[PDB]
Design a protein around this ligand. Structure first.
Ligand SMILES: Nc1ncnc2c1ncn2[C@@H]1O[C@H](COP(=O)(O)OP(=O)(O)O)[C@@H](O)[C@@H]1O
Ligand SMILES: Nc1ncnc2c1ncn2[C@@H]1O[C@H](COP(=O)(O)OP(=O)(O)O)[C@@H](O)[C@H]1O
Lengths: 398, 399
């Protein structure tokens, strides 16, 4: 099979054509300035052959037509007919809640995706401009919609429920949903491999550390617990998010600062995290340097961040009654041996130990734990497009 | 010296006259339905004598007057007159960052307590009513105040700091405070003893499960982290407290129902917890009964509670890098073998096992963990009163 993973944008359209027989990215491209002028489409064939074309792209519908022209090119393409694409994937975050499985996008899925709109204080809704374009260009083609919150639908009631009046979950659907589902599920499957055992007999703690970070407890290959909840705000302190602070602080600030419902929300999701603590930046590579340069704020901010992730490794250690391995992925988890150490140091009491040398290695699936460590600690890079591809396949297959 | 410890609530008043000389508790009482119907005071003497008086108690002032009477009863009492009460130790949950240590009562302390009301709406207000009633019945008696936040004052910056705009820390003093200190500290000392090791060489997980629940990670007899934060709402789910939910739920709920900051606050501190889930009550005993009799809401309520305390045990295990013991105390943790069984089940992976039989034992300091368990699990009754008593004596004695 061959899957085309799409990713709609404001005025762009990223794509990948993956051959699922070897999970090889045959081609990779990106459309830009869609609707705007000076439109361009850039493609890169696996065998080192980039192609650029300056054709105006009025609508993503047209842009998608060019993506096909690029794949079909015999000199810079990788497929003769458009009929070689038997599946298309699209990742969805908000509007995805309440979906236990990846839908095969039919007439009843737009509404479903259009329902979780206002529902939950979610910013940028599902950019459908790039999804509806498939129904046109290639109708007789399977289109799967991957949900970043579906992976956590296996969580038990005593976990996704809040100790709040039951009518809230019943009247507004207030429950813990979780995110980074595709990333968490991908590395999970990977970890099980490196453990040399069936995913069914493995207890893994997956750590997605990026601008928005999230931890998940993976038992027998299913999400049983996750750090985020109703919204991505719950959980670890991250780039600009506050995380799980004292709920009472929310209304407190609103009164002491004469704020609005929207002002407090912005401050927790945009003006907080390491950005608000360091007062310097939300980007970690920057905070890391500032820190080593003697910057108190930055340093403090990094201590909070690592500390919270550490606390979570422990919290999920209980939730899973013993953890076989811990996985670190995403931007921070993959390139920062610095923060990985801050996090993993001082956990030998719970079976965690890391080989400072293997830890230095960057970008590579490696087991940075010591050989005597009771718990393995893997560093697995997340391949999103490939994850969306595996999913679309699983659906189209079954 | 004989100290009188007060623990006032919105309609109750737990008192206890302790004789600091030999440190023996003379009498223990409890006033209920203060301000409501069928007000009632109860007292138990050191020899088992129980008194009960059914009289109207409109204000705490009245209740306290009746306490003096109950304490000076001819046969069921312990003192001949109010004068034998040398000092009064009062409990106060929040003192602000302006008062993080026990101190003699004066207009300054009173001001601070009155201002921290918004930081402890369920407690400070009622605690103040006690200090007040106390100033009206025994104006000539010294009063020392002990704060629930003192014990956690040793938490490191990377723990009491929230990941919010730093100026909010300097501007409104927002940081984690923690509560139930007096309790956490006591049972911690006891855990060291049961371990037969010097406090400075221990790592304990103290769990105070009661109307209000909180867990603390004590390292070397020092509070390093606690479940509650700025106010007593953060942390575990409670009788009527939601605990640490998703902050983003506050603005959402507020807009979805045009709730006001005052309202949403009331919903989080009074309508949530196991009360909100079960839709039945905040009493863990009633919930325990209802659950077993087929009540799902109550069933789920206790499930959610036991699960939350479980995770913290796991959380603070990473904080202490291997805990030496997990200590259970307070209303629930002391008496509910039931709830404890829910919490401790399925933790052998992190080295925790319990002897289901020893776990049935009532209120007694007993180690309910298997002899081979890598982690001890003591069931230690709390003694907030002797603690406050000692504090009171110290402050007053030392001028
Ligand atoms: N035998 C018991 N079984 C179950 N829960 C109990 C029991 N005894 C006490 N509790 C729990 O403790 C709560 C009150 O404890 P706490 O807050 O420490 O106050 P108090 O000073 O009255 O003990 C009760 O609402 C809840 O049921
Ligand atoms: N070498 C590094 N040192 C520190 N932080 C890094 C490093 N590499 C990546 N990061 C983190 O990853 C982020 C990358 O953002 P992005 O590519 O969108 O991925 P993510 O979703 O993981 O954040 C950077 O802002 C930084 O926070």
């Amino acid at each position: 099979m061959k899957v085309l993973v799409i990713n709609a944008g404001s005025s762009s359209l990223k794509y990948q054509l993956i051959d699922m027989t070897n999970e090889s990215a045959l081609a990779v491209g990106l459309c830009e300035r869609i609707g705007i002028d000076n439109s361009i489409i850039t493609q890169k064939k696996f065998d080192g052959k980039k192609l650029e074309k300056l054709t105006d792209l009025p609508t993503h519908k047209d842009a998608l037509e060019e993506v096909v022209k690029a794949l079909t090119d015999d000199e810079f393409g990788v497929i003769k007919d458009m009929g070689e694409i038997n599946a298309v994937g699209h990742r969805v975050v908000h509007g995805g809640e309440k979906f236990t499985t990846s839908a095969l996008y039919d007439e009843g899925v737009e509404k479903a995706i259009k329902d979780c709109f206002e529902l939950a204080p979610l910013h940028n809704p599902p950019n459908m401009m790039g999804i509806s374009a498939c129904a046109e260009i290639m109708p007789g083609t399977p289109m799967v919609i991957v949900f970043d919150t579906a992976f956590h639908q296996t969580m038990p009631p005593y976990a996704y429920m809040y100790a709040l009046p039951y009518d809230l979950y019943e009247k507004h659907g207030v429950r813990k949903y979780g995110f980074h589902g595709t990333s968490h599920k991908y590395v999970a499957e990977r970890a099980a491999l490196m453990l040399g055992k069936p995913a069914e007999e493995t207890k893994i703690i997956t750590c997605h550390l990026g601008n928005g970070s999230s931890i998940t407890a993976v038992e027998g290959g299913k999400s049983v617990e996750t750090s985020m909840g109703f919204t991505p705000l719950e959980g670890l302190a991250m780039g600009t998010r506050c995380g799980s602070i004292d709920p009472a602080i929310v209304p407190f600030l609103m009164e002491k600062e004469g704020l609005t419902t929207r002002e407090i929300d912005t401050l927790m999701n945009k003006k907080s995290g390491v950005l608000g603590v360091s007062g310097l930046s939300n980007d970690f590579r920057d905070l890391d340097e500032a820190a080593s340069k003697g910057n108190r704020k930055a340093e403090l901010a990094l201590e909070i961040f690592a500390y919270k992730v550490k606390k979570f490794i422990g919290e999920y250690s209980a939730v899973l009654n013993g953890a076989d391995a811990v996985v670190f992925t995403a931007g921070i988890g993959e390139n920062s041996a610095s923060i990985r150490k801050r996090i993993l140091t001082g956990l030998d009491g719970i079976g965690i130990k890391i080989d400072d040398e293997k830890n230095k290695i960057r970008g590579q699936e490696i087991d940075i734990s010591t050989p005597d460590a009771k718990v393995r600690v893997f560093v697995i890079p997340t391949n999103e497009e490939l994850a969306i591809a595996r999913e679309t396949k699983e659906i189209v297959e079954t």
